[PDB]
Every structure is written in structure tokens, then in C-alpha cells.
Design a protein around this nucleic acid. Structure first.
Length: 111
DNA sequence: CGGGTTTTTGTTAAGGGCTGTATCACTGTGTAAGACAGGCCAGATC
DNA sequence: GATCTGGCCTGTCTTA
DNA sequence: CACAGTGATACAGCCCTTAACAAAAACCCG
């Protein structure tokens, strides 16, 4: 309606937003653990995956009737850290530190 | 009223990229009480 | 003193 | 034959390029 009345593209179409979404969602930024994760793959492009984690759905074994969707924890934390980079940099600048510091950060979480 | 001359307007083919629209399988709003027929015990009775 | 009547109940159906 | 949504996918539609030609709308002159 805005583009039809005004005649100027103040907002972009839906596909532009759909394309821009791929920057904030997890499984987009590269990373690497010091000591390789145990029993965990190294794919850094793992988005939304099935929550059943490959659970068998055959009629023979234990009947399962639940669906699930979830991210991968490590990619989730990577996306979370990418989301709040500006706040971390501002906190470093406020406490009279250097922006080029790379000391071991400590991040506590609440499940 | 035409040639000579000039400035606009398409026209083909193939490929790229942005925009708009149809298509898929579905939902949430239609949600408490009353009329009535049948069975059954307590009791007045002739 | 069994014998129906009356009312009490009670499950079912009809709209929501 | 209730009907307005609801997010992702595919495809039509509508812009873009080069390349010579080819037609259309006007003014000097005859």
C-alpha cells in the first residue's frame, strides 16, 4: 500500500528480508574449538535440524509420536556472541581496556 | 503537395537480476441447561 | 393388605 | 457453497546488455 500510494520504495519486499535473515540465524559464522569437540561434528553450517537426533521410527521398536526441532548448542552460542559484539566492545572500552585484547573471556549462562 | 535532412522509436537474438503473484496444506471463530419418557417406592385405600 | 397414584428420581435427547 | 490468513517455493513478468537495420514524425526547399 505504501509503494502504491507514495510511489517510492520506503520498505523492501519480503524476499530481501528473507535473504537478510541468513546473517543472524546460527550456522553462519566460522569458528574452531581448541580441543576438538568429542562426538561432535565440525560443520559450521548446521541450521535447524530434527530434534529426534536420528531416532528410529519403525513400527517394530518403541513407538515414538513426538516431533522436535532444535539448533546445535555450540552454533547457538556462536550466533549469540555475534549478536552482542557491539555491547562487548563498548564494555571493553568503558573499563579502560584495549580493543585489540584477546584474553580468555568467561561467559556464564543460565539454562 | 514530395526529396533532403533531421531527431525519436522499435526490433532480433540470448542471457542476468529484481519484483510480483500463484500454490501448498492448514486454522479460528460457530461450546450448558432444559424437556421428557420410563422406572420405582411411600402411602391412602375399600 | 395388596393395589394402584403421585411424585421423586434419572437417563437420554435437543439446542449450544 | 464462511473466509481471512501464513510462511516458503517456483515461475511468469518485467527491467537490464550488444547490434546493426528499419520504420515514424516533423522542418528546409522545390
Amino acid at each position: 500500500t505504501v509503494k502504491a500510494i507514495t510511489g517510492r520504495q520506503i520498505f523492501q519486499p519480503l524476499h530481501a528480508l528473507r535473504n537478510a535473515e541468513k546473517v543472524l540465524l546460527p550456522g553462519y559464522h566460522p569458528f574452531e574449538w581448541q580441543p576438538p569437540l568429542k562426538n561432535v561434528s565440525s560443520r559450521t553450517d548446521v541450521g535447524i535440524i530434527d530434534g529426534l537426533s536420528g531416532l528410529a521410527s519403525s513400527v517394530d521398536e518403541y513407538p515414538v509420536d513426538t516431533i522436535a526441532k532444535r539448533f546445535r548448542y555450540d552454533s547457538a552460542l556462536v550466533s549469540a556472541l555475534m549478536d552482542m559484539e557491539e555491547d562487548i566492545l563498548e564494555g571493553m572500552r568503558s573499563q579502560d581496556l584495549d580493543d585489540y585484547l584477546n584474553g580468555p573471556f568467561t561467559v556464564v549462562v543460565k539454562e
